[PDB]
Amino acid sequence: HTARLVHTADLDSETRQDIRQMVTGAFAGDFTETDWEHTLGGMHALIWHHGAIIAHAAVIQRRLIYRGNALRCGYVEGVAVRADWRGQRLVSALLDAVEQVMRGAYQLGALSSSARARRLYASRGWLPWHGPTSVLAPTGPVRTPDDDGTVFVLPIDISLDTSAELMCDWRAGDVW
Template sequence: MPIHTARLIHTSDLDNETIDNAHRLLVEAYGGQFTETDWEHTLGGMHAVIAHRGALIAHAAVVQRRLLYRGSALRCGYVEGVAVHQDWRGQGLGNAVMDAAEQVIGGAYQIGALSATGAGERLYRPRGWLGWRGPTSVL
């Protein structure tokens, strides 16, 4: 299996074509269930991208959030918009974009967090991500 490496780019440095391609990839990967609100949550941080011959085939983003835990506000790197083009699944690209996302989290944040679909859990759990058992809310 070939080894893939994601390129890290801040939202402000993404060109319009890459932004459009990332949005399209996410909408397609989530079967049309990826909303404009989901897209907005994906912007404003670092993006891990993998392209093949100019086509975007994998994406993940890390954006800053505040996570309140036991009265403390933690600086959180929140993973958003993880997707691999359907023709490229099963080749390690999900792990490659998560490698890059985790590098960002480890270098800049106190904690990492994400919300996972059932399919996503198969990617995240073997990497050491744990399910949260407590309540959650948005401020």
């Protein structure tokens, strides 16, 4: 019913493995070792039932460049509810915890959604990015057309022109 927030460095090895395995199975294989690396470093929202982790979402810190400013961003990764626990709105409890972190620490939240999860985020006030997305790669700005149509943002202490360019910072694997 309610998620508990734990920083990566506060996860014991057993809990870390339990999280990785649950998230990985929830994605049915579509979750790579670099996707797992992207869930580390920040706050994990976790819901347990009788000692088993049944839901997870992580919010990690990065910068998103918007109109020349490198905005302090809480980026959401690894959102997953164990299959047998789906359809009980557990994801709402995960997102209440992640959005609380955003309000207290960041200028905006952001994330990359599948087409079917778009409704979930929009219903909570997240906004679909309509402008071109890019990544500040080591060679300079590079457009990321495969991620267009997947980015959502949650403004905290700003109004955003969601049809402007948005440029994430660099990492391996999927940059968004």
